Amino acid sequence: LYFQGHMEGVRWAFSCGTWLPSRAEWLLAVRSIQPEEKERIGQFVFARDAKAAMAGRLMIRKLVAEKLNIPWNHIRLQRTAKGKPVLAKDSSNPYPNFNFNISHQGDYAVLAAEPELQVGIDIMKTSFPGRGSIPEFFHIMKRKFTNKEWETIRSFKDEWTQLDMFYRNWALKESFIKAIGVGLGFELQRLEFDLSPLNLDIGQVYKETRLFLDGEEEKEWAFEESKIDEHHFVAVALRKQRQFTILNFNDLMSSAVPMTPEDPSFWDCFCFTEEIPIRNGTK
Ligand SMILES: [Br-]
Ligand SMILES: [Br-]
Ligand SMILES: [Br-]
Ligand SMILES: [Br-]
Ligand SMILES: [Br-]
Ligand SMILES: [Br-]
Ligand SMILES: [Br-]
Ligand SMILES: [Br-]
Ligand SMILES: [Br-]
């Protein structure tokens, strides 16, 4: 009809864990986001958490700028009372059902967006418990997975593969929870995932896992599963192609423009994990 591209699904990842901006680059990223968002970033204690939060902010603005063609300096993002980032309804937007979601853990921040399908995303890093054993960890987490889920988790011989499968199952549940907006009080026991296939190759995307909610198959929901590296798993939930693209900082800054003057108090104000011994959690 018009001489115009059409938005498709977006699947982006950014390794904030390996991102080492110069001072100028960090302070420019800080200028390029909304003031109240910069304020949130300033609240973080550790550099790695600020970096991850920043990444998510830049990916969203990049998404909106480049896929909805809203000038960067005109993008108006907001948060639900529950805290979820959303695009202002006052549009410049031909996609009513446009939506996005973001997540971060370990070394990665990730974004999923869709023109029409409702979307949720969660990423998790497999790592050995900060305190206690793996069986002790499964016991703490026991109430959140069903009998069939646990049998599948424990079906493997080594506890690492079990821990890996556990994190996968947990990322699936969070992807759904984040898609529907229910948050913290939602009983995970109500979600039962049938994980297929049992083993995932790094980089590839799988779409065979099914969800049963309150004992009935949710046929209107699909789930895309990707191991982005050997230790990070991403689940994207979708209600009615898909490989993640890893971006760098230049990519995040492609449509960026400063919105606030440079603020040097956003330098030297964060802790770094190199100055502490990593213990009991990851801190
Ligand atoms: Br893209
Ligand atoms: Br922002
Ligand atoms: Br979000
Ligand atoms: Br998250
Ligand atoms: Br969310
Ligand atoms: Br692809
Ligand atoms: Br980078
Ligand atoms: Br300015
Ligand atoms: Br850090």
Rounded Cα distance, 205 and 231, in Å: 15
Fill in the DSSP letter of residue 81.
Answer: T
- With a CB cutoff of 8 Å and minimum separation 6, the contacts of 261 are 31
201 and 219 fall within a common domain: yes
Residue 226 lies in a domain: yes
**Cross-strand partners of 8:** none
**84 annotated ligand-binding residue:** yes
Q: Give, rounded to a whole angstrom, the gap between the first and last alpha carbons of the chain.
A: 55
Do both 144 and 128 map to the same domain?
yes
Ligand with the closest atom to the CA of 31: 8
As residues whose CB is below 5 A from the ion ligand 2, the structure lists 33-34, 37, 57
| CATH code, domain with 59 | 3.90.470.20
Q: How far is the CA of 7 from the centre of ligand 1 (A)?
A: 9
Resolution in A, one decimal? 2.0
Q: Provide the domain limits for residue 199.
A: 117-240
Kindly report each contact of residues 263-267 with a partner whose C-beta sits within 8 Å and lies 24 or more positions away, as own/partner: 263/27, 263/30, 263/31, 263/38, 264/27, 265/42, 266/26, 266/27, 266/30, 266/38, 266/41, 266/42, 267/23, 267/26, 267/27
Kind of pairing between the strands at 245-247 and 10-14 = parallel
In the chain, alpha helices (H)? 23-31, 35-41, 47-68, 134-140, 147-154, 159-180, 249-252
One domain for residues 213 and 199: yes
Task: Decide if 191 is inside a domain.
Answer: yes
Tally of domains within the chain? 2
**CA distance linking residue 23 with residue 1, whole number of Å:** 46
Alpha-carbon gap, residue 45 to 139, rounded angstroms: 30
CA angle in degrees (0–180, nearest 5) for 277-141-131: 20
What is the whole-number distance in angstroms between the Cα of residue 214 and the centre of ligand 9?
40
Q: Is residue 4 part of a domain?
A: no
User: Is the same domain home to 210 and 249?
Assistant: no
- 163 and 183 co-located in one domain: yes
